[PDB]
Each structure stands twice: as structure tokens, then as C-alpha cells.
């Protein structure tokens, strides 16, 4: 999918790999090789009004 | 001076509360008492 990868401060557990939220969507993943918790967030979007 | 408490599992539904730190703090049996079903 698409999303901005930023360094997150959410501390995970040694057995956790994915991350959900209240909306039941992915918002944080663990990198496979270099273990580090990221923060997946969609790009900028909105409505064009004229 | 040893003692174990072997129990048996069964298919149940539980409403787990996840803390902000990512740990489970409470849970609801969802079928024990009517208050649990309401919660």
C-alpha cells in the first residue's frame, strides 16, 4: 500500500510485527532486517473547492 | 513444596482492554454474568 514512513515512539513487544488502531487499519510496522518501529500514515489529501 | 493449577480451555469470547503502553489490563468474560454481556 501507500503511506509515509516516519520514526514512531510507540514501543512494541518482541513478538509483535504489525500495528492497528481504533479504525482497524495498519498504522505501524516493524522493519524486517533492522528492527525499528515505523509509523505508516497516508499522504496528504482533501477536497478541491473553486 | 510444589503445587500446580492445571485448567481446561474452551472457545469463549473476551473483550480485552489494551493500555496506551500496549499491554492488556482488564478483560470481560462476555458470557459469565449478565453484566459481562452488557459490557
Amino acid at each position: 500500500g501507500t503511506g509515509v514512513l516516519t520514526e514512531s515512539n510507540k514501543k512494541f513487544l518482541p513478538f509483535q510485527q504489525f500495528g492497528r488502531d481504533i479504525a482497524d487499519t495498519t498504522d505501524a510496522v516493524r522493519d524486517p532486517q533492522t528492527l525499528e518501529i515505523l509509523d505508516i500514515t497516508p499522504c496528504s489529501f482533501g477536497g478541491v473547492s473553486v | 513444596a510444589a503445587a500446580y493449577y492445571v485448567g481446561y480451555l474452551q472457545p469463549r469470547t473476551f473483550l480485552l482492554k489494551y493500555n496506551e503502553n500496549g499491554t492488556i489490563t482488564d478483560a470481560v468474560d462476555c458470557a459469565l454474568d449478565p453484566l459481562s454481556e452488557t459490557k
Binding site: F18, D21 | F14, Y18, I24
Partner: peptide, 25 residues
């Protein structure tokens, strides 16, 4: 034999998904 009541014990992490401030079922 003897018996003992399990006072709200035996709860484990169901999956390997992180959740914060979420009441999942």
C-alpha cells in the same frame, strides 16, 4: 483432589498485532 477458583487469570495476547487504547474482542 483439591480445587481452586481461577480469579480472572489465563488471558494471553491473541495475535501479534499492536493496539493502544483499543477495546478489541
Amino acid at each position: 483432589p483439591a480445587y481452586t477458583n481461577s480469579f480472572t487469570r489465563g488471558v494471553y495476547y491473541p495475535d501479534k498485532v499492536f493496539r493502544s487504547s483499543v477495546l478489541h474482542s
